[PDB]
């Protein structure tokens with residue numbers, strides 16, 4: 001495993017709302033929960049910015065994280081991400097936030113502590129370009 | 138290359154509908170075909186769950202796969218994924234299924250065996266958190 | 275870092291429109307700018323194909339790139355990608371193009387040289403399948 005520093009921004013986290021964790025040893029992602037104080041309605045076509053109450057610091061520039069929709073919420077309820085895929089840079093230290101977009105025609109309720117997205121840590125490569133007139137092998 | 142076990146769930150696979158394969162030596166993804174018995178209409182804004190007739194077992198927890206829209210179908214026909222990006226965990230052993238979402242204003246027909254998404258195998262990192270009061274280097 | 279060959283297809287690139295570059299040492303992605311000659315309107319629900327004026331050649335089959343929405347444009351303006359996520363194969367040598375999709379209810383103007391998406395280089399794994407009757411460890 002790789003160590004990622006995490007700062008708790010809302011005292012509910014770790015008390016009434018658990019920290020993100022892998023469901024199983026073979027899980028690729030961690031479910032991300034929202035830290036709101038009362039249930040929130042997301043109308044058809046509405047986008048709402050939902051806080052997580054946590055900040056992470058990946059630090060290692062060979063690593064990033066992406067925020068993805070949950071499969072069931074996205075397929076069954078059309079509850080996905082307004083930016084489609086959220087990209088977390090290694091030097092980002094602010095709160096993780098979810099752009100929650102209801103792409104369906106049905107109203108949806110988000111309760112405090114609900115899992116609304118998933119977080120996946122991926123290696124990334126920092127490219128340097130070489131400008132050429134023609135491509136070569 | 139890396140070996141991924143594949144179980145055929147529908148006898149058409151490998152007979153009338155080919156197994157997923159890289160188009161070229163330099164392809165990042167494999168086209169994923171649907172295993173339906175008759176053509177299916179996907180109306181504007183409709184989401185339909187489409188089977189592939191295959192199950193995979195990635196097994197290695199340092200590896201995952203993602204299901205992505207095809208570029209031409211998504212750009213030209215608005216045929217994309219209802220969950221936007223499908224994440225396949227290393228310990229998932231069920232059938233691969235596509236959440237096919239028509240985001241366009243035109244009706245679309247999916248024929249048996251059509252390529253509707255693409256599958257990409259990516260390394261992933263399992264993070265362990267360290268809860269801190271302030272971030273450090 | 276890893277060297278990626280880049281061919282300039284429009285003489286504005288590197289003169290009036292900068293080459294893609296990482297904003298910070300810890301950035302995971304590079305902002306991708308559009309190479310159009312006059313401002314372009316993107317109406318609600320409209321998809322437009324926007325050129326970048328550059329081609330890249332990743333070459334290494336263990337590497338790919340993805341094109342993702344920008345977070346603010348996607349969350350605030352609903353300016354995302356019609357194919358949701360663009361996948362760039364290592365053997366692709368054509369112009370990078372953005373499927374720009376306005377998922378919002380507000381008209382949006384794209385100016386020449388605007389950053390409209392981001393590009394991320396990721397390692398990928400080329401799988402070989404082993405067809406089995408039952409999965410094993």
Ligand SMILES: O=c1ccn([C@H]2C[C@H](O)[C@@H](COP(=O)(O)O)O2)c(=O)[nH]1
Pocket residue numbers: 067083085086087088089092095096097098099344345346
């Ligand atoms: O869904 C998202 C996308 C981004 N970010 C964070 C992590 C990014 O590194 C940072 C800056 O976003 P940019 O506008 O620079 O992409 O915002 C989120 O909290 N959620």
Ligand SMILES: O=c1ccn([C@H]2C[C@H](O)[C@@H](COP(=O)(O)O)O2)c(=O)[nH]1
Pocket residue numbers: 070071072204220222223224225226229232233234235236
């Ligand atoms: O588009 C998708 C997304 C997920 N899955 C499979 C692989 C996942 O590991 C499994 C469980 O999904 P979750 O609800 O746990 O994300 O479903 C698919 O078949 N297709």
Ligand SMILES: O=c1ccn([C@H]2C[C@H](O)[C@@H](COP(=O)(O)O)O2)c(=O)[nH]1
Pocket residue numbers: 207208209341357359360361362363366369370371372373
């Ligand atoms: O948003 C996108 C998606 C793809 N491509 C390029 C890179 C791919 O390797 C190539 C071929 O696309 P396919 O139809 O084979 O996926 O098009 C783009 O320019 N932009």
